[PDB]
Amino acid sequence: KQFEQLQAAIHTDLGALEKSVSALEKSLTSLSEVVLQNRRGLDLLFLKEGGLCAALKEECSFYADHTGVVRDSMAKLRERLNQR
Amino acid sequence: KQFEQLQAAIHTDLGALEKSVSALEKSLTSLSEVVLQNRRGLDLLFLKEGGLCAALKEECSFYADHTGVVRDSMAKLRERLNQRQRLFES
Amino acid sequence: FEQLQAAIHTDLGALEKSVSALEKSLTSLSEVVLQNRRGLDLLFLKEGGLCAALKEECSFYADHTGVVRDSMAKLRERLNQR
Ligand SMILES: [Cl-]
C-alpha cells in the first residue's frame, strides 16, 4: 500500500547512494594520480636537497589508500540491489 | 506500528548518508582546486622542459571529475527525503 | 518483512563503511597535497609564494570531513544497536 511505495523509494535511494559513493571513489582515485605525479615532480625539483620532505625537513606524508574497501563494498551492494 | 519507528530511522539514516556524501563531495572538489593550482605551479616550474609530464617522461594524469553526478543525485535525494517527510507529516 | 529490514540494514552498513573509507582516504590525500603545497611555496618564496607567482587567488582546502566522521560514527551506533 503506502508500504510498497516507501519500499520502492528506499530501494531507489540506496542505489542513488551506491552510485554517488562510486562516482566519488573514481574521482578521488583519479585525483590521487594527479597528486602523486605532482609529488614526483617536486622530488625531481628538490633532487639536490634529498627530495621534497628532506627539503621541508618534515615527516613524509604518504597516501593511505582505503578505496579497495569502497570498490569491493559497492560492487557487493549493486549485486544485492537486484533484490526488490 | 514498529513500522512507523522504522520509517523514521531509515529517513534519518538516508539523510545522514546524504549529508555525508555531500560533505565529502564539497571537500573533494575543494581539495581538487588546490591540487590543480599545484599542477599549474609545476607546469610553470618546468615550462622550459615542456611541462611537468614532459620533464617526468610520463603519460600525463588528469582529474576525472564525476562530482557533477554526485551533486545532482544528492540534491535529488534531499528533495525526496524532504518530500516524503512532508507527506508523512501531512 | 524481517528479511527486508535485514537487507536494508546490511546495505546501510555497507554505505557507512564505504563513506568512512572514502573519508580516511581523502583526509590522507589532503596531507600529501598540503605538503606538496608547502613545497611549491618554498620554491616560489621570493615571489611571495605559489599563488602570487601564478598571479591567482589562492585555493585553500575547505575540509568538511569532521561532519562526515561525526555523522558516520552515529550511523554505526544506530546500526549496531538494531
Ligand atoms: Cl598536489
From Swiss-Prot, chain A:
Motif (CX6CC): 53-61
Coiled coil start-end: 1-47, 57-84
Subcellular localization: Virion membrane; Cell membrane
Disulfide bonds: 53-60
Stretches for region Immunosuppression: 36-52
Membrane topology value: Single-pass type I membrane protein
Source taxon at top rank: Eukaryota
Record's protein name: Transmembrane protein
UniProt source species: Mus musculus
Classification of source organism: Eukaryota, Metazoa, Chordata, Craniata, Vertebrata
